[PDB]
Design a protein around this ligand. Structure first.
Ligand SMILES: CN(Cc1ccc(Cl)cc1)C(=O)c1cc2c(Cc3ccccc3)n[nH]c2cc1O
Length: 207
């Protein structure tokens, strides 16, 4: 298990998201689904020049899995996945410019709902989750588990859980007062409102 500090600006954006009063929390789902969609476009595109890239799974989809007992909402995709270099350094470097532009936009009167336009949409997960666990598998690498409860740090470890072939799985450990995102009618209403035109099947699992 390796522990890493977030870049100062990312830690700052996460504290802003956790501490600001903002009732329109549902926007987190559209952001996560959008990231899943981008990952699926990436593997779909790469497979046109190299079909062997689909040997770790042909089906390109998104699964929404609520679990009332564990108090979790899982977003699973069969996209390109991420390498250790994406998790640790690469994505953090890009997030720096996006974070800065977003905070600047917020000071100038922009809304938290515009987070996605700055490429930092993922951090809206902290409107509803006390902890986020990300399981990922890229064709060129091993299966990894990324994790953060904010507080300025994240961990990366090799995942010795059930293999997932290829893709990314986002496990949202919800805050006690955010259990409405475990309700079928609530998730359906959110998907229909903000994610109706995603070019991949979205299956909302029932309990
Ligand atoms: C290749 N991609 C697409 C991708 C990558 C980076 C970004 Cl910033 C956006 C999209 C994925 O595997 C991927 C990532 C994410 C994230 C962001 C993230 C969380 C923790 C650690 C790292 C990144 N949320 N939901 C996702 C779903 C995905 O399929």
């Amino acid at each position: 298990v390796e522990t890493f500090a977030f870049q100062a600006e990312i830690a700052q954006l996460m504290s802003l998201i956790i501490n600001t009063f903002y009732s329109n929390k549902e926007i987190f789902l559209r952001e996560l689904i959008s990231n899943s969609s981008d990952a699926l476009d990436k593997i779909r595109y790469e497979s046109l020049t190299d079909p062997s890239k689909l040997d770790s799974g042909k089906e390109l989809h998104i699964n929404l899995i609520p679990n009332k007992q564990d108090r979790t909402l899982t977003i699973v995709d069969t996209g390109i996945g991420m390498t250790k270099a994406d998790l640790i350094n690469n994505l953090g470097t890009i997030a720096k410019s996006g974070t800065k532009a977003f905070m600047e936009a917020l000071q100038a009167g922009a809304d938290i709902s515009m987070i996605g336009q700055f490429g930092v949409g993922f951090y809206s997960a902290y409107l509803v989750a006390e902890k986020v666990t990300v399981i990922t598998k890229h064709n060129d690498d091993e299966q990894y588990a990324w994790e953060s409860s904010a507080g300025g740090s994240f961990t990366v470890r090799t995942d010795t859980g059930e293999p997932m072939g290829r893709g990314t799985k986002v496990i949202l450990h919800l805050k006690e007062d955010q259990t409405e995102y475990l309700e079928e009618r609530r998730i359906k209403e959110i998907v229909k409102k903000h994610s109706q035109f995603i070019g991949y099947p979205i299956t909302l699992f029932v309990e």
